[PDB]
Nucleic acid binder design. Structure first.
Ligand code: MG
Ligand code: MG
Ligand code: MG
Ligand code: MG
Ligand code: MG
Ligand code: MG
Ligand code: MG
Ligand code: MG
Ligand code: MG
Ligand code: MG
Ligand code: MG
Ligand code: MG
Ligand code: MG
Ligand code: MG
Ligand code: MG
Ligand code: MG
Ligand code: MG
Ligand code: MG
Ligand code: MG
Ligand code: MG
Ligand code: MG
Ligand code: MG
Ligand code: MG
Ligand code: MG
Ligand code: MG
Ligand code: MG
Ligand code: MG
Ligand code: MG
Ligand code: MG
Ligand code: MG
Ligand code: MG
Ligand code: MG
Ligand code: MG
Ligand code: MG
Ligand code: MG
Ligand code: MG
Ligand code: MG
Ligand code: MG
Ligand code: MG
Ligand code: ZN
Ligand code: ZN
Lengths: 114, 110, 91, 154, 69
RNA sequence: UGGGCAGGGCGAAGCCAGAGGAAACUCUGGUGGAGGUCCGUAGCGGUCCUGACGUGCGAAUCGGUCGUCCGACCUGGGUAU
RNA sequence: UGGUAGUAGCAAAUAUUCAAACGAGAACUUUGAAGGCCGAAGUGGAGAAGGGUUCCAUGUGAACAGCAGUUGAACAUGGGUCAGUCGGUCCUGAGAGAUGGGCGAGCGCCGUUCCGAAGGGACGGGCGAUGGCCUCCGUUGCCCUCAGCCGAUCGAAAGGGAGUCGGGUUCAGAUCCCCGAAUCCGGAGUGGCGGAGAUGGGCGCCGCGAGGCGUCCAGUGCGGUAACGCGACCGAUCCCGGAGAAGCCGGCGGGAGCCCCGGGGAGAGUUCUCUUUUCUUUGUGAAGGGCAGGGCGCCCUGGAAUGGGUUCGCCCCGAGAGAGGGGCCCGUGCCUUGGAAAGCGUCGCGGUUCCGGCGGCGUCCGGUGAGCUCUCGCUGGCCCUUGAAAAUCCGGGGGAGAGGGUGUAAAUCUCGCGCCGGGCCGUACCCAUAUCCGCAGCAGGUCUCCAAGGUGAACAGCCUCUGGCAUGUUGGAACAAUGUAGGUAAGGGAAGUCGGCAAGCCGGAUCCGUAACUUCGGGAUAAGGAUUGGCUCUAAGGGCUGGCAGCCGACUUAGAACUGGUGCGGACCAGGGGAAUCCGACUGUUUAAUUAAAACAAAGCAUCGCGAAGGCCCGCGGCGGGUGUUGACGCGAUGUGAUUUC
């Protein structure tokens, strides 16, 4: 059984120093250092725990090299807020304004009676 | 073949040699997959499947053959009970339609 | 198969800390670990996230409450008293 | 290291386009997504914070402000509250019964959060072992392993 | 690297200025054309032998052709 | 600010099934693995032989036997008194 | 400088033997053979701290390596460390530390946002100057206008931190040197090109038509009901959000690496008998494309009790369950480019040498596993513990503004390519029973990664494979006493001794059984019993395909017969037990180097002070500082010490 060593001067099993096993074309098992797994961006709703879909879950600095369409989605608040809260905000924004209009109409009727 | 495995040549407990949790989860997987195979083949209905699922979780049937034999006898007794009910319901329907036809015949007379 | 007869969740402490202390902690441990019905969703999915902090599994709504119970007698009494005070002051 | 939970409340700045965030002492009965009103004209209900000079006698408040503009320094521990007993419109001073049992006169211009502090009843549950005590005090400060003086040398 | 599946696109790639050399590797049951560019070593994989030699005759004259083996 | 701690024993809450009962509920067989829990390695420490040595391997070490070994656990580096 | 005295000693960790070579000389160097040890938590292979030439080759044997040495980590000669991608460098954590200020006789001290005029920046607009085909733009100089920040700055070779892998090469260096494939960041007048923004509609005409001229209009994309997708698809000051960025533990599932089994090949071991036998090898990088495989607290149709779906456990469901259809993320797995050219195993030729030399072949088919390690994912438990910031990057709301009037179109592009560069410092070796610290080649101490086969519960102990070593600062000859380390002892069984000190007895597993007491949790492996080997059977515990048939694959449990000199957890591993007293609740800590305890500590209990111009305390000093990012469920000062009774 082939026993292998670190290929870097860091000899501590820290978070950054995590490796995997890969077989070289020379028929040899050699450590290959793997970057930490990225995470999908979280929505700005603050209620939904599920991470956003359609966005690459890579390390934050890797987002520079990615294309624009692979970082967001074709929607309002797309890529930073889930569609569930988006449609809820749309409905709430409409309904609150409608009630405000109704309140102003009631105030107008109250002043007319006054 | 079974040699060199007697009580003398055993230093660990039976739990360590074969964990109870693993044996239990093996049985649970086998019985539950058998139950859903029967359900998808329509050999058992949804309600019987649910009741058997809970009874399996309750540690009733230790073996797959015991479970399927229990299913077979339940199906046999239920089918006969359904046969008796269908005959009685058919006879009741015959009586009800007979008196209804007699009533409508009397109304046709009047 | 009722495993014990008197001690319940407090049985994890074994024969330590004294009987009176164990029976006194048992009721509070039951209260703080049993899940309560959320007043916003109706599902019995209220868990004590931290000291005095309760969270809903489905509503995902965080409620400030008692250390070991969802709402203390002092809290509900104060809430009723304040509501009556507002009614009396504002007619 | 604090026995009382905190609530992060976000207001809209009236002088520039921004959303200010602040942390208040959580009063039990409050929840996320709730509208909390702060000011003189805010009505009397749990969660709102308004000056003492407006609230009636016998009310229950928390995070009492010792001086006008002090941001709240009195009655801000878990399960503790202050009761407003009487007012005095002349000199604008109000007597408040502190949780320690003493009554203090307070200017009627400082604010106080209505309700009791959440997280009450903590002392009711007995600490059971050194482990609970060690973890309780490690967060706060190094004062737990108190050696009695008589055990020491002179 | 890249795998070119068509033929005319490979011809355009070979005629591109970035192509410094092209090499022909013929193994059993396959013929490969590797064209070296500044970034990618494009490979064309074909099985028709007479079409492969037609391709090598149609290669631009300005590219360094290097037969392997 | 990082790293680390074999294999087993006892079996807390929670949950399932069956039996009994008017109810309250009570029993039996299961799953579950909680514990400043137990045996026991690595590690940490040093009870006894008051063993060995005692101008020594050593200005405090060595052998067997030993306490603990999921947490008031052990440990590196940075830093403060 | 003597006697001691050629004395004490050169005794911790099983062990060496034979032949040859160099050499003047060999128990000690080298080679070959044999016998051994470390036994994958190593006497192996590689790091960090530390050391600094100890690393490599040749020569010498003056001195040292407590014998000797042909040997050395000794001495003398010369070499050896190559980076955009490995780290430092960047950020900030606990902290440290200037300016303002205050104090101080004074060197200086306090203090880190506080008793501060703390901005050297900018979208845009205006004035004026320069250069280039003075078109348009760039550098500016001045003015208008806009602008928060949290404190200059230091602080990690284990925290965050974009981006290099495969093969080969040396006496010594390889993610650095050669070869081949890549990738990140920055830059760009004429953008070097292609593509997007893109080229449509209406009307008047000509032409049989296709199609061609003349006028207006639109054109910062398109698609699907949806999760969202497509190759890009303008955009400022401002604002919000995310990633960076999270504890410990348990269970389970997926994927790799290792191990195991049945075969094909190639090469070696045995063949007095047998063995279609036994041992080694039997592969593909990073970055892309495609497809498996996992996960979803994502969506669409429809709405359920006779309740249903479902895990090892759970859990979920009119706030929309089962049944279908889709959408997204990871895709480290498989195929392919890379890539068989290279590597490896064999057989054969060459250069008589100097050779990444030349050649043939093969580098194959399969199956399972509570197997071990790593990683990914799901879920749950615990906290009077809630388990870090910043640098940096991205997305979103907004339309302040820009771009052209129908084309040679433009502003603008996070799309495919192209062009150039990436500075500075370390890079050898040792890493530990001989390269470090202990005065030394000192049995002491010194932070981590990789972990095979058998037995076995096991990373226990024992034996073995890869790898390493010569028995730990000497050898030979005898086997006296007294010793140190192991044992064995007839009969008695603690009669010895302060004292069962020491030694000895039990000991694993399976089937029975288990008391006084009790805080009801325990005591408990209580106590006390029986079985254990080998061989041959029987019964039971499942998948895949088409109550049935066939084919597969594993480990177990129970029962029975036969048999051995009653031996059978046969080595190793491996608890003596009971009855009471005192003290201490217990877990834990304690006098490093004589005292590990009844001592200390601890949860529990009971007091005291303090509502902030405050209590306790520090400070020479200060509008000083710690508690305090604190407010009586808090902080500080005491006593007692589980529970019950008082
Ligand atoms: Mg780092
Ligand atoms: Mg996208
Ligand atoms: Mg069990
Ligand atoms: Mg302390
Ligand atoms: Mg003393
Ligand atoms: Mg323990
Ligand atoms: Mg002694
Ligand atoms: Mg002596
Ligand atoms: Mg123990
Ligand atoms: Mg002598
Ligand atoms: Mg020695
Ligand atoms: Mg080495
Ligand atoms: Mg050397
Ligand atoms: Mg010598
Ligand atoms: Mg390079
Ligand atoms: Mg200073
Ligand atoms: Mg710095
Ligand atoms: Mg770092
Ligand atoms: Mg590969
Ligand atoms: Mg469904
Ligand atoms: Mg080859
Ligand atoms: Mg917009
Ligand atoms: Mg090196
Ligand atoms: Mg080593
Ligand atoms: Mg030294
Ligand atoms: Mg020896
Ligand atoms: Mg020797
Ligand atoms: Mg030595
Ligand atoms: Mg005897
Ligand atoms: Mg005898
Ligand atoms: Mg005697
Ligand atoms: Mg003894
Ligand atoms: Mg006992
Ligand atoms: Mg007594
Ligand atoms: Mg004690
Ligand atoms: Mg101490
Ligand atoms: Mg001592
Ligand atoms: Mg001692
Ligand atoms: Mg006292
Ligand atoms: Zn949401
Ligand atoms: Zn809810």
């Amino acid at each position: 059984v082939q026993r292998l060593t670190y290929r870097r001067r860091l000899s501590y099993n820290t978070a950054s120093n995590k490796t995997r096993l890969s077989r070289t074309p020379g028929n040899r098992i050699v450590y290959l250092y793997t970057k930490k797994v990225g995470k999908a961006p979280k929505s700005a709703c603050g209620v939904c725990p599920g991470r956003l879909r359609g966005v690459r879950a890579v390390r934050p600095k890797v987002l520079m090299r990615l294309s624009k369409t692979k970082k967001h989605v074709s929607r309002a608040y797309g890529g930073s807020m889930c569609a569930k809260c988006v449609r809820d905000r749309i409905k709430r924004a409409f309904l609150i304004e409608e009630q405000k209009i109704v309140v102003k109409v009631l105030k107008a009727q109250a002043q007319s009676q006054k | 073949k079974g040699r060199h495995m007697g009580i003398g040549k055993r230093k660990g407990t039976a739990n360590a040699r074969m964990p109870e949790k693993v044996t239990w989860m093996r049985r649970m997987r086998i019985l539950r997959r058998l139950l859903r195979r029967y359900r998808e083949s329509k050999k058992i209905d949804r309600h019987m499947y649910h009741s058997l699922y809970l009874k399996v979780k309750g540690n009733v049937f230790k073996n797959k053959r015991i479970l399927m034999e229990h299913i077979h006898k339940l199906k046999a007794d239920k089918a006969r009970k359904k046969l008796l009910a269908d005959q009685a319901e058919a006879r009741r329907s015959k009586t009800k339609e007979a008196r209804k036809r007699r009533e409508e015949r009397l109304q046709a007379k009047k | 198969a009722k495993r014990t007869k008197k001690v319940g969740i407090v049985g994890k402490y074994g024969t330590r800390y004294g009987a009176s202390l164990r029976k006194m902690v048992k009721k509070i441990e039951i209260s703080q670990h049993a899940k309560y019905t959320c007043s916003f969703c109706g599902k019995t999915k209220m868990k004590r996230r931290a000291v005095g902090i309760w969270h809903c599994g489905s509503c995902m709504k965080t409620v400030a409450g008692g250390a070991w119970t969802y709402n203390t007698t002092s809290a509900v009494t104060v809430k009723s008293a304040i509501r009556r005070l507002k009614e009396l002051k504002d007619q | 290291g604090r026995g009382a939970p905190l609530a992060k409340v976000v207001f809209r700045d009236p002088y520039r386009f921004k959303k200010r965030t602040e942390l208040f002492i959580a009063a039990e009965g409050i929840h996320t997504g709730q509208f909390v009103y702060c000011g003189k004209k805010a009505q009397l209900n749990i969660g709102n914070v308004l000056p003492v000079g407006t609230m009636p006698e016998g009310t229950i408040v928390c995070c009492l402000e010792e001086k006008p503009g002090d941001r709240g320094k009195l009655a801000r521990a878990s399960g503790n509250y202050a009761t407003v007993i009487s007012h005095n419109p002349e000199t604008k001073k109000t007597r408040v019964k502190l949780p320690s049992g003493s009554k203090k006169v307070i200017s009627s211009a400082n604010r106080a959060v209505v309700g009791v502090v959440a997280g009450g009843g903590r002392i009711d549950k007995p600490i059971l072992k050194a482990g609970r005590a060690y973890h309780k005090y490690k967060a706060k400060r190094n004062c737990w392993p108190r050696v009695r003086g008589v055990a020491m040398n002179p | 690297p890249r795998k070119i599946e068509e033929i005319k696109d490979f011809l355009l790639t070979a005629r591109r200025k970035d192509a410094k050399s092209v090499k022909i590797k013929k193994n059993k049951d396959n013929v490969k054309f590797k064209v070296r560019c500044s970034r990618y070593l494009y490979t064309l994989v074909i099985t028709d032998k007479e079409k492969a030699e037609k391709l090598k005759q149609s290669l631009p004259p300005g590219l360094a052709v290097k037969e392997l083996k």
